[PDB]
Write an enzyme that holds these catalytic residues in place. Structure first.
Site, PDB file in Angstrom:
ATOM      1  N   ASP A 146       0.866  -1.208   0.000  1.00  0.00           N
ATOM      2  CA  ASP A 146       0.000   0.000   0.000  1.00  0.00           C
ATOM      3  C   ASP A 146       0.888   1.240   0.000  1.00  0.00           C
ATOM      4  O   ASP A 146       0.580   2.226  -0.630  1.00  0.00           O
ATOM      5  CB  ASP A 146      -0.876  -0.004   1.254  1.00  0.00           C
ATOM      6  CG  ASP A 146      -1.919   1.110   1.151  1.00  0.00           C
ATOM      7  OD1 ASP A 146      -1.618   2.216   1.571  1.00  0.00           O
ATOM      8  OD2 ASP A 146      -3.001   0.840   0.656  1.00  0.00           O
ATOM      9  N   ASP A 186      17.915   9.979  -1.994  1.00  0.00           N
ATOM     10  CA  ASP A 186      19.076   9.052  -2.072  1.00  0.00           C
ATOM     11  C   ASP A 186      20.336   9.841  -2.426  1.00  0.00           C
ATOM     12  O   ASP A 186      21.311   9.292  -2.898  1.00  0.00           O
ATOM     13  CB  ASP A 186      18.808   8.004  -3.153  1.00  0.00           C
ATOM     14  CG  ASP A 186      19.456   6.678  -2.751  1.00  0.00           C
ATOM     15  OD1 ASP A 186      19.120   6.172  -1.694  1.00  0.00           O
ATOM     16  OD2 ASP A 186      20.278   6.189  -3.510  1.00  0.00           O
ATOM     17  N   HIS A 238      -0.529  17.528   7.135  1.00  0.00           N
ATOM     18  CA  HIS A 238       0.492  18.278   7.921  1.00  0.00           C
ATOM     19  C   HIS A 238      -0.144  18.827   9.202  1.00  0.00           C
ATOM     20  O   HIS A 238      -0.838  19.824   9.184  1.00  0.00           O
ATOM     21  CB  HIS A 238       1.025  19.434   7.071  1.00  0.00           C
ATOM     22  CG  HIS A 238       1.930  18.892   5.997  1.00  0.00           C
ATOM     23  ND1 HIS A 238       1.457  18.529   4.746  1.00  0.00           N
ATOM     24  CD2 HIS A 238       3.280  18.642   5.975  1.00  0.00           C
ATOM     25  CE1 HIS A 238       2.506  18.084   4.028  1.00  0.00           C
ATOM     26  NE2 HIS A 238       3.642  18.132   4.730  1.00  0.00           N
ATOM     27  N   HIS A 247       7.268  10.455   8.038  1.00  0.00           N
ATOM     28  CA  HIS A 247       6.856  11.646   7.264  1.00  0.00           C
ATOM     29  C   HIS A 247       6.179  11.161   5.979  1.00  0.00           C
ATOM     30  O   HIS A 247       5.104  11.606   5.630  1.00  0.00           O
ATOM     31  CB  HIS A 247       8.074  12.504   6.929  1.00  0.00           C
ATOM     32  CG  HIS A 247       7.605  13.865   6.495  1.00  0.00           C
ATOM     33  ND1 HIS A 247       7.523  14.931   7.373  1.00  0.00           N
ATOM     34  CD2 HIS A 247       7.173  14.340   5.283  1.00  0.00           C
ATOM     35  CE1 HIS A 247       7.055  15.989   6.682  1.00  0.00           C
ATOM     36  NE2 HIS A 247       6.825  15.683   5.402  1.00  0.00           N
ATOM     37  N   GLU A 248       6.795  10.250   5.273  1.00  0.00           N
ATOM     38  CA  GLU A 248       6.182   9.736   4.019  1.00  0.00           C
ATOM     39  C   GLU A 248       5.109   8.675   4.321  1.00  0.00           C
ATOM     40  O   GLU A 248       4.023   8.720   3.779  1.00  0.00           O
ATOM     41  CB  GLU A 248       7.275   9.139   3.131  1.00  0.00           C
ATOM     42  CG  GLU A 248       8.462  10.101   3.074  1.00  0.00           C
ATOM     43  CD  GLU A 248       9.756   9.328   3.327  1.00  0.00           C
ATOM     44  OE1 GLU A 248       9.764   8.131   3.091  1.00  0.00           O
ATOM     45  OE2 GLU A 248      10.717   9.945   3.750  1.00  0.00           O
ATOM     46  N   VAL A 299      13.924  19.297  -0.186  1.00  0.00           N
ATOM     47  CA  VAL A 299      13.066  18.113  -0.501  1.00  0.00           C
ATOM     48  C   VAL A 299      13.699  16.838   0.064  1.00  0.00           C
ATOM     49  O   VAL A 299      14.405  16.122  -0.618  1.00  0.00           O
ATOM     50  CB  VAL A 299      12.917  17.986  -2.018  1.00  0.00           C
ATOM     51  CG1 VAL A 299      11.713  17.099  -2.341  1.00  0.00           C
ATOM     52  CG2 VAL A 299      12.704  19.374  -2.628  1.00  0.00           C
ATOM     53  N   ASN A 353      -1.255   4.563  -4.932  1.00  0.00           N
ATOM     54  CA  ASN A 353      -2.189   4.541  -3.772  1.00  0.00           C
ATOM     55  C   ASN A 353      -1.375   4.268  -2.507  1.00  0.00           C
ATOM     56  O   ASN A 353      -1.543   3.257  -1.854  1.00  0.00           O
ATOM     57  CB  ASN A 353      -3.202   3.412  -3.987  1.00  0.00           C
ATOM     58  CG  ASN A 353      -4.525   3.755  -3.303  1.00  0.00           C
ATOM     59  OD1 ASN A 353      -5.211   4.671  -3.705  1.00  0.00           O
ATOM     60  ND2 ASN A 353      -4.916   3.046  -2.279  1.00  0.00           N
ATOM     61  N   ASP A 395      15.941  15.616  -4.709  1.00  0.00           N
ATOM     62  CA  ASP A 395      17.110  16.515  -4.806  1.00  0.00           C
ATOM     63  C   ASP A 395      17.905  16.486  -3.501  1.00  0.00           C
ATOM     64  O   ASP A 395      18.072  17.509  -2.871  1.00  0.00           O
ATOM     65  CB  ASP A 395      16.607  17.927  -5.044  1.00  0.00           C
ATOM     66  CG  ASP A 395      15.590  18.289  -3.959  1.00  0.00           C
ATOM     67  OD1 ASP A 395      15.809  17.913  -2.817  1.00  0.00           O
ATOM     68  OD2 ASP A 395      14.611  18.936  -4.290  1.00  0.00           O
ATOM     69  N   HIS A 424       2.551  10.499   5.296  1.00  0.00           N
ATOM     70  CA  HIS A 424       2.001  11.287   4.162  1.00  0.00           C
ATOM     71  C   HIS A 424       0.868  10.530   3.469  1.00  0.00           C
ATOM     72  O   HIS A 424      -0.182  11.077   3.197  1.00  0.00           O
ATOM     73  CB  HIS A 424       3.112  11.508   3.152  1.00  0.00           C
ATOM     74  CG  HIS A 424       3.385  12.980   3.009  1.00  0.00           C
ATOM     75  ND1 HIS A 424       3.594  13.581   1.777  1.00  0.00           N
ATOM     76  CD2 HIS A 424       3.500  13.985   3.940  1.00  0.00           C
ATOM     77  CE1 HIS A 424       3.822  14.891   1.999  1.00  0.00           C
ATOM     78  NE2 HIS A 424       3.776  15.190   3.300  1.00  0.00           N
ATOM     79  N   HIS A 478       9.114  11.949   0.382  1.00  0.00           N
ATOM     80  CA  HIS A 478       7.646  12.152   0.169  1.00  0.00           C
ATOM     81  C   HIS A 478       6.974  10.869  -0.314  1.00  0.00           C
ATOM     82  O   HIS A 478       7.624   9.918  -0.698  1.00  0.00           O
ATOM     83  CB  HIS A 478       7.411  13.279  -0.853  1.00  0.00           C
ATOM     84  CG  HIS A 478       8.098  12.985  -2.169  1.00  0.00           C
ATOM     85  ND1 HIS A 478       9.069  13.827  -2.698  1.00  0.00           N
ATOM     86  CD2 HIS A 478       7.932  11.981  -3.096  1.00  0.00           C
ATOM     87  CE1 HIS A 478       9.447  13.323  -3.890  1.00  0.00           C
ATOM     88  NE2 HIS A 478       8.781  12.196  -4.183  1.00  0.00           N
ATOM     89  N   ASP A 535       2.710   5.391  -1.410  1.00  0.00           N
ATOM     90  CA  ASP A 535       4.084   5.039  -1.844  1.00  0.00           C
ATOM     91  C   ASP A 535       5.017   6.109  -1.305  1.00  0.00           C
ATOM     92  O   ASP A 535       4.887   7.251  -1.648  1.00  0.00           O
ATOM     93  CB  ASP A 535       4.136   5.039  -3.372  1.00  0.00           C
ATOM     94  CG  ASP A 535       3.448   3.790  -3.923  1.00  0.00           C
ATOM     95  OD1 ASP A 535       2.242   3.834  -4.106  1.00  0.00           O
ATOM     96  OD2 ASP A 535       4.137   2.813  -4.161  1.00  0.00           O
TER      97      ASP A 535
HETATM   98  C1  LIG Z   1       9.988  14.947   9.384  1.00  0.00           C
HETATM   99  O1  LIG Z   1       9.324  16.071   8.823  1.00  0.00           O
HETATM  100  C2  LIG Z   1       9.740  16.436   7.562  1.00  0.00           C
HETATM  101  C3  LIG Z   1      10.002  15.448   6.606  1.00  0.00           C
HETATM  102  C4  LIG Z   1      10.434  15.812   5.333  1.00  0.00           C
HETATM  103  C5  LIG Z   1      10.612  17.155   5.020  1.00  0.00           C
HETATM  104  S1  LIG Z   1      11.182  17.582   3.420  1.00  0.00           S
HETATM  105  O2  LIG Z   1      11.595  16.381   2.782  1.00  0.00           O
HETATM  106  O3  LIG Z   1      12.133  18.639   3.506  1.00  0.00           O
HETATM  107  N1  LIG Z   1       9.934  18.150   2.539  1.00  0.00           N
HETATM  108  C6  LIG Z   1       9.147  19.242   3.188  1.00  0.00           C
HETATM  109  C7  LIG Z   1       9.589  20.564   2.613  1.00  0.00           C
HETATM  110  C8  LIG Z   1      10.752  20.650   1.863  1.00  0.00           C
HETATM  111  C9  LIG Z   1      11.112  21.887   1.351  1.00  0.00           C
HETATM  112  C10 LIG Z   1      10.293  22.993   1.609  1.00  0.00           C
HETATM  113  N2  LIG Z   1       9.168  22.920   2.331  1.00  0.00           N
HETATM  114  C11 LIG Z   1       8.828  21.721   2.821  1.00  0.00           C
HETATM  115  C12 LIG Z   1       9.120  17.144   1.819  1.00  0.00           C
HETATM  116  C13 LIG Z   1       7.950  16.666   2.696  1.00  0.00           C
HETATM  117  O4  LIG Z   1       7.629  17.247   3.713  1.00  0.00           O
HETATM  118  N3  LIG Z   1       7.321  15.590   2.304  1.00  0.00           N
HETATM  119  O5  LIG Z   1       6.233  15.110   3.033  1.00  0.00           O
HETATM  120  C14 LIG Z   1       8.577  17.828   0.584  1.00  0.00           C
HETATM  121  C15 LIG Z   1       9.689  17.925  -0.461  1.00  0.00           C
HETATM  122  C16 LIG Z   1       7.405  17.028   0.014  1.00  0.00           C
HETATM  123  C17 LIG Z   1      10.356  18.147   5.959  1.00  0.00           C
HETATM  124  C18 LIG Z   1       9.912  17.791   7.239  1.00  0.00           C
HETATM  125 CA   LIG Z   2       0.360   2.356  -3.307  1.00  0.00          CA
HETATM  126 CA   LIG Z   3      16.929  16.613  -0.831  1.00  0.00          CA
HETATM  127 ZN   LIG Z   4      10.209  10.519  -4.870  1.00  0.00          ZN
HETATM  128 ZN   LIG Z   5       5.086  16.539   4.387  1.00  0.00          ZN
END
Ligand SMILES: COc1ccc(S(=O)(=O)N(Cc2cccnc2)[C@@H](C(=O)NO)C(C)C)cc1
Ligand SMILES: [Ca+2]
Ligand SMILES: [Ca+2]
Ligand SMILES: [Zn+2]
Ligand SMILES: [Zn+2]
Length: 173
Positions: A59, A100, A129, A119-120, A81, A93, A76, A123, A84, A95
């Protein structure tokens, strides 16, 4: 900007995930750890259940990757980033994927293994959030993937709790 009040991500009562992430900073069990701390972070905040695999597609396919997905959600490592996941759809659905290009550690040695893991995993099968000033969606800019606090807050617990929650009555279909 927060969880979707009226649109629950997953509805089923048994989700599953795939540990496709990994790194020298985290052996199988370590990257799998964040997948286990993330998965468990939301598996515990909600009553929902979860399973695991490494084929076809669970899932929440947790996989490691970077700027090279194809033509969308470009990672990146060398960029905010950090990681996510996807939303409710066809194969996306649920992932998640860890950058890396940098690294991920459960402690505060690389990035934030289970931090960005829940976080993911949070997600897709967790929430959008919540007040993560304490929760897991905003600790990243700090340290809490395993050090001595590593865990979610009551706001992300609230978002995911809004995802699943206690059963009303019908125990089965
Ligand atoms: C643990 O909480 C967090 C996990 C991951 C991030 S992140 O990867 O930096 N990022 C959030 C973000 C990046 C740049 C600017 N504003 C926000 C991810 C994320 O949160 N994914 O769920 C983004 C790239 C999707 C931050 C906090
Ligand atoms: Ca999935
Ligand atoms: Ca990055
Ligand atoms: Zn990705
Ligand atoms: Zn997030």
């Amino acid at each position: 900007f927060r969880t979707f009040p009226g649109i629950p991500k997953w509805r089923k009562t048994h989700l599953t995930y795939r540990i496709v992430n990994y790194t020298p900073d985290l052996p199988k069990d370590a990257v799998d750890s964040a997948v286990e701390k993330a998965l468990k972070v939301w598996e515990e905040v909600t009553p929902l259940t979860f399973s695991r695999l490494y084929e076809g597609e669970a899932d929440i396919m947790i996989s490691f990757a970077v700027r090279e997905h194809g033509d969308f959600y470009p990672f990146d490592g060398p960029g905010n980033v950090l990681a996510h996941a996807y939303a409710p759809g066809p194969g996306i659905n649920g992932d998640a994927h860890f950058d890396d290009d940098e690294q991920w550690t459960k402690d505060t040695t690389g990035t934030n293994l289970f931090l960005v893991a829940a976080h993911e995993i949070g997600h897709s099968l967790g929430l959008f959030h919540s007040a993560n000033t304490e929760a897991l969606m905003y600790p990243l800019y700090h340290s809490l993937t395993d050090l001595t606090r590593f865990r979610l807050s009551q706001d992300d617990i609230n978002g995911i709790q809004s995802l699943y929650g206690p059963p009303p009555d019908s125990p089965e279909t």
